[PDB]
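User: Assemble these into one structure.

Assistant: Restating your components, then the assembled model:
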Amino acid sequence: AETVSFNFNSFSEGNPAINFQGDVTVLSNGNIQLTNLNKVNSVGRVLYAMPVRIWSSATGNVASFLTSFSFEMKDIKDYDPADGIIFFIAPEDTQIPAGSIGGGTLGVSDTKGAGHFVGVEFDTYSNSEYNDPPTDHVGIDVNSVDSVKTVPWNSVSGAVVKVTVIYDSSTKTLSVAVTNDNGDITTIAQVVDLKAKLPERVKFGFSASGSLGGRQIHLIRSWSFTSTLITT
Amino acid sequence: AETVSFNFNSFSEGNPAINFQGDVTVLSNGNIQLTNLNKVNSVGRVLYAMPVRIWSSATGNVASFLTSFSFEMKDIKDYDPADGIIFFIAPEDTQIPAGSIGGGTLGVSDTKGAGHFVGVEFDTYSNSEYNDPPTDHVGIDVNSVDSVKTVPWNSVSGAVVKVTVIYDSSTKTLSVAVTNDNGDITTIAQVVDLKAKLPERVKFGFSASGSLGGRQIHLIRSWSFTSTLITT
Amino acid sequence: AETVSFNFNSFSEGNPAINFQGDVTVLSNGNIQLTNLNKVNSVGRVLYAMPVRIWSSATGNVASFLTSFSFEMKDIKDYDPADGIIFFIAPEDTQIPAGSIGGGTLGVSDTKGAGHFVGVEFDTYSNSEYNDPPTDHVGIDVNSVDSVKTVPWNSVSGAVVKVTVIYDSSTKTLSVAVTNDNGDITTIAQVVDLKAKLPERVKFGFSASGSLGGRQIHLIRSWSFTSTLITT
Amino acid sequence: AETVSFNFNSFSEGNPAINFQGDVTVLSNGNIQLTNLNKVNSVGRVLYAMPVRIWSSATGNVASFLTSFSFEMKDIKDYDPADGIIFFIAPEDTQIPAGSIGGGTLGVSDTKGAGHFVGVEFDTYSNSEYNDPPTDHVGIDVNSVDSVKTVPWNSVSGAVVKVTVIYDSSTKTLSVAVTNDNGDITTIAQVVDLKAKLPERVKFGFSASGSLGGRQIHLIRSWSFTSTLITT
Ligand SMILES: CC(=O)N[C@@H]1[C@@H](O)[C@@H](O)[C@@H](CO[C@@H]2O[C@H](CO)[C@H](O)[C@H](O)[C@H]2O)O[C@@H]1O
Ligand SMILES: OC[C@H]1O[C@@H](O)[C@H](O)[C@@H](O)[C@H]1O
Ligand SMILES: OC[C@H]1O[C@@H](O)[C@H](O)[C@@H](O)[C@H]1O
Ligand SMILES: OC[C@H]1O[C@@H](O)[C@H](O)[C@@H](O)[C@H]1O
Ligand SMILES: [Ca+2]
Ligand SMILES: [Ca+2]
Ligand SMILES: [Ca+2]
Ligand SMILES: [Ca+2]
Ligand SMILES: [Mn+2]
Ligand SMILES: [Mn+2]
Ligand SMILES: [Mn+2]
Ligand SMILES: [Mn+2]
């Protein structure tokens, strides 16, 4: 078997173990702040520097992974609390889309909402152009911000949120669990054939965006990960 | 929103939140020891004392849940290292089956291997009478120790094992993530309609068993849990 | 350590984690209504169905606890707005006293006003037989509705009240902070030895009562709680 | 009645509602970071700009208050996680002690550990020169970091801690409740005559300090407060 595992209790701008793209910054408290509040159509992303091999061209085997992370989103005067954070998987050469308008694209898609990635978004603004639900929601995205499936959710300002994600390669199922502020959990699962949607080696990371009037604090507090690919 | 959440970092015999059944004992370090090393066909089970409402007969809604736990199995001189541990869900009046032979039944089924429960087993002995795979394995059981599905796994003597489970009510998916000694993860997921398999009120817990020749130390070290049922 | 914690933002009938006694009811809005407006000497109580271990006879240790809740009392035609609500603690076999007259007993004591419980009352009627102050008030009750101590308070019809109670086992101090509708706080603290007044296992909850002419809407809207007993 | 009440979900150095002293900085995420990680004997404090009238020389009455806050301390390399945060009350003209050495002084006392203030410390280092318990502890201090009383407590790096404090006027009791990462709650209470120990007008606030080798992230995330003084 081939395993990739890491853990971040804190983040440091200097550490090369992570790629910083766009407006991302690292606060003195070790928190990764994805977007710049004083910028229009801001976009910031972070990827685990080491590309992870999710499937073998020799066997056809796809890896399973268990990952958990905690983030925080807080409102600011005077802007709509937008746009949200998305935990994504993409080609290792992934970079913020050219001419990104941020906002509802969440830093991973073009204006039409399309891009090459698979992710779990924590959306805090209803974009009708991307067919978003009416309330805050968590969604499974496959090459588009027009979610394959979504689930009602509530983004509480200044609340630490914990997420646990399990991908089981045999059933090709991606299961998510979000632990809210009131103590309630919110789950969402979807079958997604990663090998069919993504290349052999990829990068995992987070992205967040904003617009002219849509802005809020997007923070990544921690992140643990373990992927295992059967090589036999 | 109806939620049940608890977190055991250790245990005590006087903790009312825990129902002890069979040969269960509590070690001075807070660990629960499920089987008696000196008894033939030993059986021990521990349960969260409070019955949990997993689905509504009024709305048809089914709860989602996130639960994590860590156990440890250790060989002893010089019995066969058997039989294993099973995280189960069963009717609130669940009790060790009458005339339990322990062993491959894992304390949750009858001689034929049937019973009323849903669970994730960590099997260390291949019982041909229950169609077990040839090696240790993690299984998803529904009313029977003859697993609906299993995955190859390896139980390391004296190794602390971490497990995270996610049940998504919408897709009825029960996904398990097992973190091994060497940091490798093993996963298994299966669609299981709890509403169709179990009554509205149930109890969650752990069970382990041995036989005359098959014995080993079965320890439950910690357990956190959160179930949420959408109501009104 | 042994901890019991929970958080209710609303309530629903059927939740096995709650014991309903008497005339209690759950409204469509998740609120718990303690008394029946058409019944003479009405009494309704709600208890967390999980017994809480407040002290150990083995170690002699006593638990500490933090709890918060919000309630609302609202007048009705043509009865006197009575009798009030009491947050209480009693033996786990606690039931509404047999042949209760409700009224000023607040559903936890006998006709003389005696009982086996400890609690914080929110009194809206002056019962001279129990030496009540002449106006509305918050009181600390130890085995009697004839409060060991009281502080002038005022129950505003329809006002949502917030309460926070801290019990420090070391000093045996029970402090209460009541946040009125107009933003003012009212506090009352009393040294109460729970190890000396209650058994090792108890149940927490609320009770409200009325009489023939004294009636009113008694609502419990939320309730969070955390008690910890050191077992080391 | 005279009541003061406020609430901060986020902080800003451009806001007049707060005084900033020393190395205190406000991160882009809204958190207040009390100590500078790059300075020796660092010290930073903040105070609610408006002095709170806690007692009257005309009537002798003393105010009761309920205040809760959340903070965060996180380790860093290669320094000892020190020294801690202290929520204090002091003369309205309080200032960082002249020639402060930070460290165990928590930024409120002199080298001897004496000063004019009442506070609740969250101590993460054992200074023998101040008779500190051998482990992390929460203490009630009255004009000295040589705590009047302490209770064992575990400071978890990167964990958000919630605190609730109630000062009962009549009993002159100050009781505190702290929420741990494991879920357990910790409390400590002590009788403190604010009238005798502090002036009529005071300021409430937080302070944290570090040394040459002792440094860590000291964050203040939110703070609500309500005090009521009877004027009659
Ligand atoms: C009545 C009878 O035929 N007896 C048989 C024994 O001969 C032998 O087959 C045992 C095997 O029990 C299993 O033992 C292992 C360990 O060595 C595990 O504990 C299995 O779960 C057991 O079933 O069964 C009867 O006693
Ligand atoms: O007001 C806020 C919003 O503004 C829109 O212009 C943008 O497309 C949305 O994604 C969101 O940022
Ligand atoms: O008029 C109202 C009141 O009536 C009394 O008879 C009763 O004892 C009081 O507790 C209160 O209900
Ligand atoms: O190692 C760290 C510590 O070092 C001491 O010298 C200092 O007095 C303490 O307050 C703390 O800073
Ligand atoms: Ca959107
Ligand atoms: Ca078996
Ligand atoms: Ca009365
Ligand atoms: Ca110290
Ligand atoms: Mn969306
Ligand atoms: Mn099996
Ligand atoms: Mn009274
Ligand atoms: Mn100290």
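The pocket of ligand 1 is lined by residues B 80, 82-83, 103-104, 125, 127, 210-211, 213-214 (CB under 6 Å).
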